[PDB]
Structures are given as C-alpha cells and as structure tokens.
Design a protein around this nucleic acid. Structure first.
Ligand SMILES: Nc1ncnc2c1ncn2[C@@H]1O[C@H](COP(=O)(O)OP(=O)(O)NP(=O)(O)O)[C@@H](O)[C@H]1O
Ligand SMILES: [Mg+2]
Ligand SMILES: [Mg+2]
Lengths: 251, 121, 217, 345, 121
RNA sequence: AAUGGGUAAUUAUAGCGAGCUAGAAAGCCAAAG
RNA sequence: ACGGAAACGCUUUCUAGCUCGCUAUAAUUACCCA
C-alpha cells in the first residue's frame, strides 16, 4: 500500500530529428556519407525503434501507450511505471543511437478522476518547457524540476534517490517529518537556511542512538555537502529526489 | 558592519576565528566558549525577533537598548564571551540597528553564530 | 450516550512552588528564574501541562507493568485517561487538565503580603575554595490556593470504565501530595494539598452520588 | 511506592543565621526600649515627610558625627520629638550581650544581616539550606567522593568537579541522580520571638584573643526545635539518609581532629545529639571538603583580610546562657553548631 | 535626564570618567570604586525593578522617594561612591522618574553602569 | 589602647533549544458508455 | 445581429494528537580598616 495514488502522463520527442535527418551524416567524411541509403536506413532505424521497441520497453509496466511513432511517445500510466518507462526508454535510445539524438520528455503527475485534455495539455507544456532547458531535458511534474537526463538518471534517480531510500529504510527514528523539514529547507534556501540546516542536522546527529550515529553522520555530511555546493545543479536534484521518496512511501 | 548578503558568512568565519582549546586533549579543539553562555545571548535576540514581527520599532527601543547592556555584561564576566563579541563585531553591529530590517538582520546574525557554533564541535 | 463531568479542587500550596518562566530581559541583580504567571494580572498560574506531566509520569511508575521507556507505551489505563499519540482509538484521552489561577488573592492580601511571589536567594557553595554563585529564583507564596478544574468525558465506550478511572485520578492526586509539581522538589518547592474535591456533571446525565464518596476516601 | 519519608528534628545549640541576602544599614533601626525596632523605612520616610524635616533627615544620614549612640536614628527621633513609631516592620528583643561596653553604647550596633523570611513575614529555615548541610556530611564521610574532586590543571586551583557525584540527564543512560532522590522540605515558619541578632567574635589560634567584628547577623536563638521532612525515593538514597546518624558523628570526629584541635576546649561545645553545621558563620571548613582544601582554600586570599596561616580563625558569638551548652564562661557559642535526630515515618 | 537612545552611552562615558589609582602602579587603571559598593547600589533598585512590573506606580512611589535617600546615604560614606553619583547624574535622574517607563529606565541604567564597570577592569 | 566603622569576592554555572504522526482526501467533472 | 447565449472552481473538512521548564546547587566565604 505504499505509494501515492497518482497517475503520470509522459510526452516525448526526439530533439532536432529533422536536423539529424537532413544534415545528419554530413559531418564525418567530406559529404561522402550523405546519400539516400543512409537516410533510408536511418528512417528504418528510427521507425523500428519507435514502432517496435517501445512495446518491448512497455512490457511489464502498468501504462498505456496512447501514441508512439515518428519521434513521439505519448503514454499514460502509473507514475512509478512512467518514470521507469522513460528512464528505460532513453537509456535504450542512447545505446541505440550511440549517444546521438537527444530525446526530451515531460512527465506530469495527476490525481485520479481528472479529464484527459486537462492532463495532456499540462503534460505537453512540460514537454515544451523541457525543450528549452538547453535542449535535452526531462521536466518532472512542474515547470521548475527541469533536469538534463544525464544530470537526472545518474544523479537524481540512481545516485541520490537510492542513497535517500537506503538511509531511510535502515532505521526507525527519523521519519517523514524529517524529510518534510528537509524539503522546506531545500525549497526556500537563502544563505540563512544553510546555517539553519547545519544546526538542524547537528542537533539530530546527537539525538540519534550510538548504534546508528555514523549512519546518520554519513548522511548529514552527504546532505549538507550538496546543499552548500554552489553549482545549483546539486540542490535542485535533492528536492526532486526527496519528492520521489515521499511519493514512494505515502500511505 | 553587516549587510543582507554577508551576515551569515561573517558568523561562519567568526566561529572559525574564535580560538579553541589547544590543550586538554579530551575531545580536543573544543571551544572555551560554552553553549549556555551563548544561548543566553540568543535568548534576548530571539524574543526581539519574535516581537519585531508584530510591534513597531518605536516600541522595542527599550529592549534594543538593553541588548547593548547584556552583551557588555556577559563579556565582562567571562573572557570567552569577550573573545566572542570582539572577534564577531557584535558591539559594532548593535551600534547600527535604527529600524526593523537591520534589527531582524542582527537577530538572524546572532542565530547564525549559534548555528555555526553547534555545527563546529 | 454522552456525558461530561468536572472535578473541582483547591491546590493549596505548602511551602510554595516554582514553575519556571521565560524572560531573558530580566535584570542583573534580580530574578533570573521567573515563575510562570498570567500575562495580564501578573498572578502565578499552575499550567495544566505541569499537572498533567506530573500525573502522567507518577502514575506511570504505578500502573504500567512494563516500564514505559517512551510516552504512548502506557498500560491502557493511562493511555485512555491521558491519550496516546500512536494508539488508533486512544488519540484523544478524555481528560482536560485546565490551568489553575490564584484564587485567594484577597485572603493573601488580608495577611501581610508585600507581593504575590516571593524571591529566594540560593547560592551554590563550591565545595572546594568555598566560593558562591547566587541565584534569585521566584516562587509563589506558601498559603496560595489555585482553582483546579478537571473535565472528564463519558462516551459510549465507558461500559464500566467510569468508576475504574476514579481510583486512578484520585490516586494520581494523592500521589501529587507525595511529590512536587516541578521546581526543585529536592529543595522543598512542591508540596501541595488538594482541598474540597467536588465532582459534578457539567453536561449530560450522570449520577455522581456514587462518585462523591470515593473522593473522600 | 518507594517514597520513604523521614522526620528530622533540629535542635539549635548555637545561633543559626540563614539567608535573605539583604541587610539593614546603620540608620535603619530604633533601640529605645530593650528591643530593636526595624521599621519599613519607606513608610518611615512617607510619614516623616509630613513632619517637614526630610532635608534635616538627609542631613542626619550624611552626618559624620562621633558618639555612635547619636548616629543610629534613635537620637534623630528623640531630639526632633518624633515619638509615634507606628511604622511597618517588626521588633526583636535584645541578646543583652551585643554591646560589650557597659559604658552606654546601647543600640550602637551597626549593620545587621536579615534572616530569610517568607512574604507573610515569618522566619523559617529553607530546605535547600538544610540540604547543603546534609550534602557535606554525605560528601566527607564517603571516601569515593574525595579523591579527584579537584583542579585537573585548568586555572587557579579553581573549583569542584561537580561530577564526582553522578548527576545529569545523561543521554543514553538510565536515571540515577542521587540528590534528586533526597528531597528536603522547608520548615514550618516559626515565630519572631526566636531571633536575637548575635554579633560575631573571631577567635584566633597562635594569638589568644577574641577580636569582635562589625557584622551582627539576625540569628535564631539556641534551643529552638525545628522540624523537617525528608523523602528518599531511591533505596540507595534511603541508605545514606538512614546512615546520617553514623555519618554526622564521623564528620564531626574528622573535623574536630582536623580543626577544633589547636583551639582551647572551653570555647568548644559538646554535641548532645547528632551534629550538623547549618549555615552562615560556621567557618569555611564546614562548607567544604575540608581534607581536600588545605592548599586550595587559602590561595584565594592575597588581600587585607587573609587567612592567617592555614585553618582559619574560629567563629564564636555571644548569645545568652541556656540549659549547659556553653561549658565555659563569657558565653561563646559556635554560630551554626546545631544538632538533629532522625526517624523514619 | 536619560532616555532610551542614550542611557547606555551615558553609562559608558560615566564609567570612563571615574578616576583611577594614580598611584599604586600594581595593575594600574584600577578604579577607586569597587564591584561590591556598586552592586550595593544596584541592589537598591533591583527590588523596585521587578516590583514595577506587577504593581502600579501610584501604589509604589514611596519606595522611589526613599531610594533617593538610600543613594544619598550610600554616597555619604565613601568618596568613591559620592564621586559616582555625580559623574553619572543619579540624584538628578531620581527626581525625574514620575512613571513606570522611567523607573524601568533608571533601574536599567544602574544595570548599564554595572555592566560597563565589569567590562572595564 | 580604646572610639568610629565594615571591607573584598560570587549575581547564576553546565544542559536540552523541540521530537514523532498526518502533508490533503472525498464529490461534482472524468469514468461507468 | 460578437464561436456566441446561459453557468460561483463550488460542497465537505478543528493545524490536530502526544509531551513536567525540568535536572544538580546551605546567600555563603574571608577577618579586618582608620
Ligand atoms: N524516421 C524518420 N525519418 C525522417 N523524418 C522523420 C522520421 N520520423 C519522424 N520524422 C519527421 O521528422 C520531423 C521532426 O518533427 P519535430 O520533432 O517536430 O521536429 P524536430 O526536428 O524534432 N525539432 P524539435 O521538435 O525541437 O525536436 C517530423 O515532421 C516527423 O514526421
Ligand atoms: Mg522533435
Ligand atoms: Mg516531435
């Protein structure tokens, strides 16, 4: 029963596909690979992927592909199996294209019993808000959580989210109140909340038992480290990771 | 002087300028300054920071004048609070309050001192 | 059915008590440990939290078989009269320990009372070098009484839990007369008497003839 | 229910002063009968400003006149014919032994220290003061509490460790707190007719004199029974507060062999019950760990008024003869030498 | 007269203006006035400062009348205290009290005097 | 020797500075069509 | 002869439950000044 009762909608698009189709092969060689056969095999590759392999990627998952083809994937479903779907889809598409041809999705969370145009338009606005991050971005749930995928799948979804889950399941003292107070200090964030966070985690370091104190010290020296990182691509990731961990353990 | 962009950084680098216990190796680099000689000084500015949100500055000038007395007195008793409020220029930050905004800036400065005192040692 | 009853009492002090206050804007050579007092009359209050957390812990050493180690591990005779946070049916706890305000201010003004709280000077003799450390702590004076309201709920879960919980509430009150309501306790400062135990129903129908006899046990 | 209550009974052999911090000055009493009248000086100045003489009063307060019986606010009222004395405070009868001079000097006492009083106005003994008398008997007669209770090489041999006796909340540990488990109550507020204001008489060794001091504290009369209630919630606390009878005898035995010897035995009282040194005028060695403060107590005095060599001047007083407690002539009590007897209820 | 924006500064420049041991060159710049004779002055007003919060001023002012005579008599004994009550205009400020907010400013000004005397020395 | 008087030090010290649960649900709508 | 006319982002919902301002602590020391 753990998990928030929401459904997500993702809309994808391969970024700059017409540019990757017309010009495409013109950089290597000296214009010697820009034939019709290269573009025909490229069309068969992209068509093969978006019309055959998306059903492979949507095999076990609880979703529905409302459209796939060309370079669009519009898909509704359960939000764990939408985020897992798009992480799997891109991590197979960048193996499929050797890391060329960025794709850039927009995922939006919606409650149950909401109309589907009010749902799809707000997903498509996240998709176009992730087109203009730089180009290659996923836009999780809102206009602000806009991450490059290489800055999302490695950092947020696998590094930080598993560290947060690993800490918050191997204990019993810290609960969701601590996670909520971390989300507030991550969202407001002036320079003063760095000091307030340094006070809060040091108070709770000496409040945990001596069995789990190096466990908490290796978590607070890991949270305070990215909170005060001064690159801005490490604090915004932690807020989305804590949103996903709260959404995983909702009653 | 403290401004809106640097009052937390001065409280960071002032705990680091406060000298610690060089000798007496039992959890060394502990401060001579104790926590309860510092939560008493914050106990004034916390109850001004909670009254400045409601009452006007022309009604709090009886307590704001007495912060200048209490920091002087607590520094006159123990040398460690003297070493605090001379390293962190608190008596020269109390000279400049003049309105609600700089008052709340100083009251957050006094909290950032305590937060970085708790964070180090 | 629904009923709501009330316990009237008088917390007569005997060597009056300190319940610590709040101000940092005190003084240099005056009261550094203020008593809690009413913010408009400047009369000492006994806050109901200091009554509740003394009765909740003194009965915990009597009625909990297994030692609690945490609140909301109480033995369901205390969990329902005070309230857990964690039992699903014992979130609320059917007792309302109202605050207590100094009743007999005119009786204390009949006696030669300069001010309603006395100040007590209490230095700490350093057991080597013989030097001192004066504290000037404030306490409400000796023959002060406090009106003690106590409101109890009787819903349709009290099949026979009504008269069982009154060998518990008066048990806790006669254990308050052996302990000290916070302050120092080990230095005096706590001894209370509970006078004119008078139970009555403020709402609903309940027969307190059989309840007003075990108040006078 | 481990609330084992006791019932201590306290018999004052010597005059006992406690507390209040404050002190009446030289011009804040009236000695015209054989009593001392201590008014409310606020009501004195209020009722005297009707007499249109407050500026002559202010002249009297800075009047540096000799012949001290004319300085003590008696002669101000006898000369200027103020005779109502309907003011606030109280009256206490005399010791009779305060002015050593039979030449007049009557009411020429100078600065009296007040006694601790409740806001009703009646004197009592606070339980926090009686617990500090219990705690030194418990500290000195327990050999585990006397070894490292010392400097640890920090400052000017400064202070007690305060942590030999295991005290605290102590996060992660159970809750001992031995002296939280020794709960001493305040006494019943006794009457004003037990107070006499003995003076002070410092009696030195190696110079056999008894030079008196200008410090005349309002002490309790001897032979005044005062009752106390002590509850011990720990069985470990119950053992010590039962064994106080052995421990007070052991403390007085180790303290007479340390300090009451080198003084003549005529000025030294006998116990007659279990001995205790209740505060204000018993000397430093009854308030300290006396067998651990031999090079550490006198170090604090590099002033005009230093402790002589070591083991400082004895603190006698002069209160009148009762029962006999004194054992000598000229009425030299010991100023704080009380006794007790305890029984479980 | 002393008001809210200046009484701590009046106390500061009062304590700097007390004369010192011109002779006795053993730890110099030491005042004639001592900590004991100044806390005997603060102990006069320390009772009235916390009787001022509870009681009305009109049921209190006879103590404020007598406290002038108390400062006179504590001045007329030592020359190091008669010097203090004239450097800091204590007797001049006792006549101008007349309410609660100046009683709690005079009793606070004595605290300021003790604070700066403890701070210097 | 008397006679005048008190003088100095401590004015609170060490702590805890909040913890945990809940973080929006149910309807209209959408679904059922 | 206005992709327009008519249409409340509306109804229900306690910032709540639990929690001792508490722990240790003689207003004491020194005996002297002119
Ligand atoms: N395999 C393919 N070969 C050639 N063209 C294709 C192929 N798949 C899709 N297209 C077309 O390529 C065009 C790309 O559309 P679109 O994605 O809107 O532009 P874009 O190049 O991706 N720029 P952007 O929308 O910012 O990503 C569409 O007209 C598609 O129909
Ligand atoms: Mg595209
Ligand atoms: Mg497209």
């Amino acid at each position: 029963g753990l998990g928030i009762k929401r459904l997500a909608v993702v809309r994808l698009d391969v970024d700059d596909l017409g540019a990757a189709f017309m010009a495409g092969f013109s950089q290597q060689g000296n214009g010697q690979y820009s034939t019709l056969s290269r573009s025909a095999t490229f069309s068969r590759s992209m068509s093969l992927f978006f019309k055959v392999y998306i059903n492979q990627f949507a095999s076990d998952k609880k979703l529905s592909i409302i459209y796939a083809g060309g370079d669009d994937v519009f898909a509704i479903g359960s939000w764990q199996d939408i985020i897992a779907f798009t992480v799997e889809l891109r991590e197979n598409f960048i193996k499929w294209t050797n890391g060329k041809l960025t794709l850039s999705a927009g995922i939006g969370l919606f409650a149950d019993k909401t109309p589907i145009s009010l749902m799809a338009h707000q997903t498509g606005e996240l998709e176009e808000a992730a087109k203009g991050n730089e180009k290659d971005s996923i836009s999780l749930f809102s206009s602000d959580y806009t991450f490059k995928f290489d800055r999302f799948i490695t950092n947020v979804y696998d590094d930080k989210l598993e560290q947060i889950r690993y800490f918050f399941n191997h204990q019993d003292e810290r609960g969701k109140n601590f996670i909520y107070k971390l989300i507030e200090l991550l969202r407001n964030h002036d320079r003063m909340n760095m000091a307030r966070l340094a006070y809060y985690l040091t108070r709770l370091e000496e409040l945990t038992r001596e069995t789990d104190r190096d466990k908490f010290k290796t978590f607070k020296n890991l949270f305070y480290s990215w909170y005060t990182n001064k690159n801005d691509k490490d604090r915004k990731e932690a807020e989305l990771a804590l949103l996903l961990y709260i959404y995983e353990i909702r009653k | 002087i403290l401004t809106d962009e640097n009052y937390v950084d001065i409280a960071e680098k002032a705990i680091l300028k406060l000298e610690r216990n060089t000798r007496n190796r039992k959890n060394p680099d502990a401060f001579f300054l104790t926590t309860s000689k510092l939560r008493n000084l914050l106990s004034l500015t916390s109850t001004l920071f909670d009254e400045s949100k409601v009452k006007e500055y022309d009604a709090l000038l009886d307590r704001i004048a007495y912060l200048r007395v209490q920091f002087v007195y607590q520094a006159g008793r123990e040398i460690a609070v003297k070493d605090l409020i001379e390293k962190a220029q608190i008596l020269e930050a109390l000279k400049e309050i003049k309105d609600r905004e700089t008052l709340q800036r100083f009251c957050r400065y006094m909290e950032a001192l305590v937060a970085y005192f708790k964070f180090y040692g | 059915t629904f009923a709501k009853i009330k316990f009237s009492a008088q917390i007569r002090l005997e060597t009056g008590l300190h319940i610590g206050g709040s101000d940092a804007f005190a003084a240099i050579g005056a009261i550094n440990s203020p008593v809690i007092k009413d913010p408009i009359t400047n009369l000492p209050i006994i806050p109901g939290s200091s009554l509740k957390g003394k009765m909740r812990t003194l009965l915990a050493k009597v009625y909990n078989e297994k030692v609690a180690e945490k609140p909301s591990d109480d033995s369901d005779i205390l969990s329902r009269l005070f309230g857990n946070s964690k039992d699903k049916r014992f979130k609320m706890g059917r007792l309302i320990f109202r605050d207590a305000f100094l009743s007999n201010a005119d009786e204390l003004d009949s006696l030669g009372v300069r001010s309603y709280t006395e100040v007590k000077f209490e230095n700490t003799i350093d057991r080597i070098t013989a030097e001192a450390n004066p504290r000037q702590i404030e306490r409400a004076i000796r023959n002060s009484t406090f009106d003690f309201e106590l409101i109890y709920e009787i819903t349709d879960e009290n099949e026979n839990q009504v008269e069982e919980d009154f060998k518990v509430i008066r048990d806790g009150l006669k254990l308050l007369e052996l302990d000290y309501l916070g302050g120092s306790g080990s230095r005096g400062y706590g001894k209370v008497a509970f006078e004119n135990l008078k139970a009555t129903t403020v709402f609903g129908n309940y027969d307190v003839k059989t309840l007003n006899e075990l108040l006078t046990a | 229910n481990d609330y084992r209550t006791f019932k201590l009974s306290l018999l004052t052999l010597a005059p006992i002063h406690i507390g209040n911090g404050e002190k009446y000055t030289s011009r804040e009493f009236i000695y015209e009968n054989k009593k001392f009248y201590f008014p409310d000086m606020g009501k004195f100045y209020n009722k005297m400003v009707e007499k249109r003489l407050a500026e002559k009063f202010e002249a009297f307060l800075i009047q540096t006149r000799p012949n001290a019986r004319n300085n003590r606010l008696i002669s101000f009222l006898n000369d200027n014919r103020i005779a109502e004395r309907s003011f606030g405070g109280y009256s206490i009868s005399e010791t009779g032994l305060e002015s050593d001079k039979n030449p007049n000097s009557a009411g020429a006492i100078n600065e009296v220290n007040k006694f601790i009083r409740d806001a009703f106005g009646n004197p009592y003994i606070p339980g926090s003061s009686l617990k500090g008398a219990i705690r030194t008997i418990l500290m000195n007669t327990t050999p585990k509490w006397n070894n490292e209770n010392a400097v640890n090489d920090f400052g000017r041999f400064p202070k007690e460790n305060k942590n030999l006796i295991p005290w605290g909340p102590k996060k992660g540990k159970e809750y001992d707190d031995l002296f939280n488990a020794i709960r001493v109550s305040d006494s019943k507020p006794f009457d004003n007719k037990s107070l006499i204001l003995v003076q002070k008489w410092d009696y030195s060794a190696k110079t056999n004199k008894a030079k008196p001091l200008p410090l005349y504290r309002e002490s309790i009369s001897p032979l005044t029974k005062i009752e106390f209630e002590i509850t011990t919630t720990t069985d470990e606390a119950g053992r010590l507060i039962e064994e106080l009878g052995k421990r007070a005898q052991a403390f007085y035995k180790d303290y007479k062999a340390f300090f009451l010897s080198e003084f003549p035995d005529d000025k030294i009282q006998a116990n007659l019950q279990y001995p205790i040194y209740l505060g204000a005028g018993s000397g430093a060695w009854t308030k300290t760990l006396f067998k651990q403060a031999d090079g550490i107590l006198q170090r604090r005095y590099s002033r005009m008024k230093t402790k002589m060599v070591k083991k400082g001047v004895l603190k006698l007083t002069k209160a009148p003869l009762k029962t006999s407690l004194v054992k000598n002539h000229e009425s030299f009590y010991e100023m704080g030498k009380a006794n007790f007897m305890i029984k479980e209820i």
